[PDB]
Amino acid sequence: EVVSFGPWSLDLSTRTLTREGQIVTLTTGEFAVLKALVQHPREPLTRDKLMNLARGREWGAMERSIDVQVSRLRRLIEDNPARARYIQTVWGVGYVFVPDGAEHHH
Amino acid sequence: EVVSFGPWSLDLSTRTLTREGQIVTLTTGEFAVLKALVQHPREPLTRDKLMNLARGRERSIDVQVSRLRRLIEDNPARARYIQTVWGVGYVFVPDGAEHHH
C-alpha cells in the first residue's frame, strides 16, 4: 500500500517517505498525521479527527500539536510551504490532503 | 507529580509545560520524550530506551530532542538540561550541571 503525490512516495508497509532515491526522516507523529491525510484524500479532516486518527483520543487535549505537525510536513513536502498544495487549510475546520495538488476551483 | 528545571515546570498529570505563566505547545512525541527524560534524571538513556519509554510499539528521537533543546535550552548548541552522551544517546540534568560538575 504505497501512495504517490508529485515527487513523493509514502510506503505504509515500511513506514518510509521517499523522493529522488532518498528516504526522508519523519517523526512518528509527522508520519501518523501524514498517513491519516493520505488515507483521506479530498476529505476535510478537523484538527480533532486528525489527532484521533494519528494518535488516539487519549491525546485529544494536545490538539494544537497537529497545526505544528502539519506546518513541519509542509516545510518538507510543499514546493512552496506558504502556498501549500498537497496539504491545504480548510478555514475554521482543519486540513485536506489533495493528491494532485489541485486548487479549490480545480 | 510536577517537575521543575530552571524556569520550566512540567506537570505529568495535566501533561502541560509552563514557563513565566505561559503554557507551551509540545507534540505528543516531544511530551513523551521530555517525560521519559525528566523521569530518569542523571541516567544516560540510549536512543532505544528513550523510544521504548516514549512510544513503546529510532532516528525520530534525535529530531525530537533537537526540537526540545531549541525550546528549553538557554543555548541550544550548548544544551545543559538535555546533554548528549556520545555514541550512546542522551541524559536529563535537572540543575543544568556540566559533566565535571
Author numbering:
A (entry chain A): 152 to 257
B (entry chain C): 152 to 208, 214 to 257
Q: Any passages from the paper?
A:
Typically, TCSs consist of an histidine kinase (HK) that senses specific external stimuli, and a response regulator (RR) that mediates the cellular response through differential expression of target genes. OmpR/EnvZ is a well-studied TCS in Enterobacteriaceae, where OmpR is the RR and EnvZ is the HK sensor. We demonstrated that OmpR is a key regulator of A. baumannii virulence using different infection models and diverse clinical strains. Overall, the chromosomal mutants impaired for OmpR phosphorylation (D71A) or for DNA binding (R198L) were attenuated similarly to the ΔompR mutant, indicating that both OmpR characteristics are required for A. baumannii virulence.
To enable the discovery of a small molecule inhibitor of OmpR, we solved the crystal structure of OmpRABA DNA binding domain (DBD) spanning the C-terminal residues 148 to 254 at a resolution of 2.2 Å. The analysis of the crystal structure showed that OmpRABA DBD consists of a three-stranded antiparallel β-sheet (β1, V153-F156; β2, W159-D162; β3, R166-T169) followed by three α-helices (α1, T179-E190; α2, R198-R206; α3, R215-I228) and ending with a β-hairpin (β4, I238-V241; β5, V244-F248). The arrangement of the β-sheets and α-helices represents the winged helix-turn-helix (wHTH) fold characteristic of DNA-binding proteins of the OmpR superfamily. The sequence identity between OmpRABA DBD and OmpRECO DBD is 69% and all the amino acid residues of OmpRECO that are involved in the DNA binding were conserved in OmpRABA. These observations suggest a very similar DNA-binding mode for both proteins, which is in line with OmpRABA binding to OmpRECO cognate binding site. The most likely interaction site (hotspot 1) in all structures is around conserved residues T240VWG(V/L)244 in OmpRABA DBD. Residue D218 in chain A may serve as an anchor point. Hotspot 2 in OmpRABA-DBD chain D contains residues S222, R223 and R226 (S206, R207 and R210 in OmpRECO DBD). The “backside” of OmpRABA DBD chain C features a third potential ligand binding pocket flanked by residues K186 (potential anchor residue), L204 and T178/T179. We used our developed D-ELISA to evaluate the inhibitory effect of the virtual hits on OmpRABA DNA binding. We only observed a dose-dependent inhibition of OmpRABA DNA binding for the compound VSIS_039 (STL300125, Vitas-M Chemical Limited), which was identified to bind to the hotspot 2 druggable pocket of OmpR (Figure 6(a,b)).
